[PDB]
């Protein structure tokens, strides 16, 4: 009924909420107390990486390039197959951790985006070190939903692009230079600094 | 060997055979399990392990 204040929720002992009626409150006590604990303790260097992400301004710039390579919907797909093959091979942005890791390993991938808010995190933890070893540029985004909006479908962990149309090439190269600044160029320094408790 | 039986022991002016525990029936106090008793068990009951055939 009533929304409890932060002070109240931090005061309550979750193990003393026992009735079926109380379960939603038990969930909220746990959620708030977990936040306080994570802010209090130091993060290892590899986990600390996913605290650094693009501004909403840069996200706009990147999305305004990438949106032009949207995947086919089922409606579009049906039409295509009633018609004959025509024209050159399309460029499309690609999705999902299994395919992306393959394209990195084959040295096909040319630029990659990764989401931060992923649980459990061990799914994405290794991607930056692999990108640095293969020499591929990348950037980190705040939420899985930010990625979903680019390709007009359900949220995802990562997106990848393997080709560049000449029309876009000028803008593309500039974007890569911005990203290298915040991310790939800084990597060797980053892997040695522990995340401070937050003020 | 079905019934609940026990000996009454000495001091009752009776033979120390096991007897049937009951009440309300004429069966109370009768003599239970032994081969010399009505409704008791036979001596060395016949048994399936006997050797039926011959070489």
């Amino acid at each position: 009924d009533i929304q409890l204040t932060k002070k109240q929720l931090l005061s309550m002992n979750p193990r003393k909420l026992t009735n079926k009626a109380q379960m939603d409150t038990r969930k909220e006590v746990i959620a708030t107390r977990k936040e306080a604990l994570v802010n209090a303790i130091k993060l290892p260097p590899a986990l600390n990486q996913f605290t650094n992400y693009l501004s909403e301004e840069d996200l706009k710039e990147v999305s305004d390039i990438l949106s032009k390579f949207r995947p086919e919907t089922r409606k579009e797909r049906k039409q295509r197959l009633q018609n004959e093959r025509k024209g050159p091979k399309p460029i499309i942005v690609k999705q999902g951790i299994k395919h992306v890791t393959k394209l990195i390993e084959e040295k096909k991938a040319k630029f990659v985006l990764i989401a931060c808010d992923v649980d459990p995190i061990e799914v994405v933890l290794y991607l930056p070190t692999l990108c640095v070893k293969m020499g591929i540029p990348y950037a980190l985004v705040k939420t899985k939903e930010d990625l979903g909006k680019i390709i007009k479908k359900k949220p995802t962990t990562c997106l990848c692009l393997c080709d560049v149309s000449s029309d876009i090439k000028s803008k593309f190269e500039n974007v890569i230079a911005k990203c290298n600044g915040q991310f790939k160029d800084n990597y060797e320094s980053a892997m040695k600094v522990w995340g401070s408790p937050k003020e | 060997m079905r019934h609940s039986a026990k000996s009454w022991g000495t001091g009752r002016a009776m033979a120390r055979v096991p007897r049937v525990r009951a009440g309300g029936t004429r069966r109370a106090g009768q003599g239970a399990n032994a081969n010399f008793c009505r409704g008791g068990r036979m001596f060395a009951p016949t048994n399936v392990n006997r050797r039926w055939n011959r070489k």
């Binding site: 260097p45 061990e122 933890l125 290794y126 692999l130 | -």
Partner: protein
Amino acid sequence: GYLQYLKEIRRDKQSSVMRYLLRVRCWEYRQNTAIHRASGPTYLDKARMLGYRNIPGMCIFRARVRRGARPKKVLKGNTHGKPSKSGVYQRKPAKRLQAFAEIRVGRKCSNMRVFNSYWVGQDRVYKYFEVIMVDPYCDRIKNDKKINWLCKPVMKHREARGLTNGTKTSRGLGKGIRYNQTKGGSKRAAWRNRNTQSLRRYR
């Protein structure tokens, strides 16, 4: 591929990243009720070795067990017998602690079958496990080709008869001279075969 990278990290249990994650997760598991449903598997690689897929009619539950040996259930230490059978403490259970988790989840989730289970954490007081469950009365499952076998009537209550990965290990089954105590099917099957008198027709 991706599942290989996860395997190597999951094996390094004293790496800095794994010590961090074990500490935070074991804190959360103890604030929750003793058996509760999970949102998904904690470890994607491990759950997928053991037969999990993200289809309707499969679920993960999580369970905790108290640690250490289990004392003899007698009052004041009085055992009414011979002195060699008078010990109360330092008596260790026959089954793994994992087996207790599986048995308790199966009671709570009575409409479902227990498939497999795995370790997810420990602390001073508890040990924590995830159990994979399936629903045999579900249209999606009844028409699958890989787990449709769980719907056979013999598959009811595998955990109670020592048939699951966690419950099987105390039976002592195996191949070779090191497992002679279970030739026949079980310890009791071996006992019968060794303590019987055979009486042929011509003898």
